[PDB]
Amino acid sequence: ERVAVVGVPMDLGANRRGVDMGPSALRYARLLEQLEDLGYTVEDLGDVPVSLARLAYLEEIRAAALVLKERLAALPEGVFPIVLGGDHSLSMGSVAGAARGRRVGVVWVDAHADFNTPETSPSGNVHGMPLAVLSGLGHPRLTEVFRAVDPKDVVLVGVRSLDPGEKRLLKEAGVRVYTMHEVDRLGVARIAEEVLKHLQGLPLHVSLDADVLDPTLAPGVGTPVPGGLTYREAHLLMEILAESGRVQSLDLVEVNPILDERNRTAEMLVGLALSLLGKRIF
């Protein structure tokens, strides 16, 4: 019944990408008003202070994610949190915070696996390491604060771009991965069912990266990758997860207004969030 929205205008890495503008764009797509139209009483908590830029910014990223984690950990139980963002790095904080010390399942819908470590990453970008850090792998400065899930409780969906070392780390941690190959073979409905089954009995945290959507349909993303999910597919996925009645938190990240076309990518993620929260055509 209660939903809290918080943004993390973060765009920290080797170079800027423009995703720090994601929260404003999402709010612009009327996420709050539509959540109210749905029947939820909503409160916008504002934004988490984030340093900007002119393993880069690890401490600044760590610092912002920490403020975020602490903020979400303090929300009363029964409050569904929605973290809006730019850099997927924020999920280190949202997942660790929204989990509130319990065992929770993570449904990571991304074109990327974000399972790199300082040793396997070709770019050194922390925003390509959040899920690995959440699983207990990576820089000591990050895992000491955000390690919150067991790789056995993580399901990746829509992945279509992986780094060599990433593949090794995912196989050895044994993370369940549904790449676009699996989507093209099984369809999103069966994959959604397998997701719920693989993580049965667990509260669910959904981390939705805008880039999972095909860039032809959703151009405004931090790192575009060709051939992703259609809008109806991402929708069906959210609907089925919603039906489980087990989703407890959500991240809407990587929106990049600079590359967007009339905020349509921000609008799609807002639409996806509504489905995850039970919005149906009828």
Question: Which residues are documented as binding site for Mn(2+)?
Answer: 88, 110, 112, 114, 209, 211
Q: Helices H, strands E: what count in the chain?
A: 11, 8
CB of 16 to a copy of itself, least distance (A): 6
Task: Give the number of other CB atoms < 10 A from CB of residue 43.
Answer: 13
Task: Tell me the per-residue interface mask from 187 to 226 with a copy of itself, x by CB under 8 A, - otherwise.
Answer: --x------------------------x-xx--------x
Point out which span in 98-106, 127-135, 159-167, 203-211 binds a copy of itself (CB under 8 A).
Answer: 159-167
The C-alpha angle 96, 149, 210, rounded to 5 degrees, equals 70
CB of 58 to a copy of itself, least distance (A): 21
Q: Known catalytic residue: 205?
A: no
Task: Tell me the per-residue interface mask from 41 to 80 with a copy of itself, x by CB under 8 A, - otherwise.
Answer: ---x-------x-x--------------------------
Residues constituting the chain: 282
Q: Which residue reads 């996925």 in tokens?
A: 237
Binding flag, residue 122, a copy of itself (CB under 8 A): no
Burial bucket for residue 182 (CB in 10 Å: 0-12, 13-18, 19+): middle
- Residue 250, strand partner residues: 82, 206
Binding flag, residue 105, a copy of itself (CB under 8 A): no
* Distance between CA atoms of residues 5 and 23, nearest Å: 10
240-259 binders of a copy of itself (CB under 8 A)? 257-259
Q: Known catalytic residue: 254?
A: yes
Which tokens belong to 222? 């931090």
DSSP-derived 3-state class of residue 126: helix
The C-alpha angle 37, 96, 75, rounded to 5 degrees, equals 45
Give 173's contacts (C-beta < 8 A, 6+ positions apart).
115, 135, 137, 151
Binding flag, residue 160, a copy of itself (CB under 8 A): yes
CB of 4 to a copy of itself, least distance (A): 14
Cβ proximity to a copy of itself: between 205 and 279 the closer is: 279
Which tokens belong to 8? 């993390």
Cα of 193 vs its chain's centroid, Å: 19
Which stretches of the chain bind a copy of itself, using CB under 8 A? Answer: 9, 11, 16, 18, 20-21, 24-25, 27-28, 32-33, 44, 52, 54, 159-162, 167, 177, 179-181, 183-185, 189, 214, 216-217, 226-227, 231-232, 235-236, 239, 257-260, 262-264, 267-268, 271, 280-282
| Catalytically active residues, by annotation | 88, 110, 112, 114, 127, 209, 211, 254
